[PDB]
Nucleic acid binder design. Structure first.
Lengths: 248, 253
DNA sequence: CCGAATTCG
DNA sequence: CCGAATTCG
């Protein structure tokens, strides 16, 4: 049974409002799909301890040891960990950083990366500085390994071109899949009301970039999750979760 | 010969929005205006009560207003020294603070002048728009009739960088401060170190208030001096305004 | 009326 | 945490 699946999701652990409850919901999803790899953003130590407790069949790597951070969970026995690298962005004022990881999935060498770039419009420029730094690390990544980035970019479709666009070797999976109609937005204030705001904003914050080495791994599917409201009256998060299926 | 070809003007953002100790600072400002008694006075951020009070004290001046309501700018002209030919008001099509260019055409002993004042869009956030106004002002200085002397004087809310960003001043238009070799005392018209009226703890030194100049023929009128006023805190406990008043002396053939 | 940090909507 | 409008010192 050779196949590979990942999930990226900004769970927003800063929104203490019904936090543990939303946590149990998120973990319900994670257990349901049981992907080989999971990317998370805005996670805090209690949330972390809970994740470590419940999902025990995963090796968990954190971007930080305190405050809020990102995290990469790896299914043990299915994913062997080769290394982990943490690179802080030198210009951050929000403690952000690029969390890289290198793993081995049944012979196939992988390079997984996650990040939570500088938030808000006012720091767009800074965000761009981070983005390039991310992109350059994907190409500079070993020619022998297949590179996969997945995270909360906090970007606009225009801004990506504004930075100078993707390299000819790196591609966003959403674009690669012909721009599916259902996956168009990962941050929708019309559908999600967790932050309690009266505006209609539909932005594709969470993105997955891909760089095959000849390619051995093909990205098959892309779907959203966390589309339903919990019993607490709220969604698990303001961002929608993103599952991706791949095959060898 | 009380006035030997001398000419004096005053521009000042009196800030009528700072109601804190307003009337007393107003009588102070009028104390200044009466003291120097310039031929022309440019004022910014003035409100209707302030206007009526100015009408009372400075009664030897014909007063023109940029607006009838809210806050606005005003041009006072000493009658018997200045004959008023016309007045024109041009709103910025892109303004969002009801700002506008207040032009006036007058005659001083044969020499025809075109005086202009404005209070451009405030804050850093509207810098681009501010630039749009500045050029629009500059071009109106360009478009202004030949043979006549053009003088702008107002609260530009500008930094030295922003002026260059627009493409720089036209070769015929000159900042008076720059024209005087950029004196150290006229360096700032908004200094939070020295002025504390809005009660702020920051060290901000900006030259907001500016005077632009354009003789058209060789120059017949030359700006002689440039000085600040409102340099002392009043007995009321405040400065006349957060902005420093700006007096300018000039001379003609 | 600075300018970054709340608040409002 | 959108994005334009207060607030503090």
């Amino acid at each position: 049974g050779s196949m590979f699946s990942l999930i990226t999701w900004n769970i927003d652990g800063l929104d203490l409002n019904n936090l543990s409850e939303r946590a149990r919901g998120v973990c319900s999803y994670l257990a349901l799909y049981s992907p080989d790899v999971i990317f998370l953003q805005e996670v805090i130590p209690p949330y972390y301890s809970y994740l470590k407790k419940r999902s025990s069949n995963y090796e968990i790597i954190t971007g930080h040891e305190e405050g809020y951070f990102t995290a990469i969970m790896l299914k043990k026995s299915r994913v062997k960990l080769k290394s982990q690298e943490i690179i802080p962005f030198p210009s951050t004022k929000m403690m952000r950083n690029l969390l890289c990881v290198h793993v081995n999935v049944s012979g196939n060498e992988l390079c997984l990366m996650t990040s939570h770039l500088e938030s808000t419009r006012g720091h767009a420029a800074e965000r761009m500085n981070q983005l390039k730094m991310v992109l350059k690390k994907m190409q500079e990544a070993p020619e022998s390994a297949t590179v996969i980035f997945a995270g909360d970019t906090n970007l606009r479709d225009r801004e990506v071109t504004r930075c100078g666009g993707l390299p000819n070797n790196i591609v966003d999976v959403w674009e690669f899949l012909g721009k599916p109609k259902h996956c168009q937005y990962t941050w929708d204030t019309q559908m999600n009301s967790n932050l309690g705001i009266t505006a209609a904003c539909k932005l594709r914050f969470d993105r997955i970039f891909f760089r095959a080495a000849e390619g051995h791994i093909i990205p098959r599917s892309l779907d959203l999750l966390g589309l339903e409201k919990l019993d607490c009256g709220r969604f698990p998060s303001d961002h929608w979760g993103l599952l991706c299926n791949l095959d060898i």
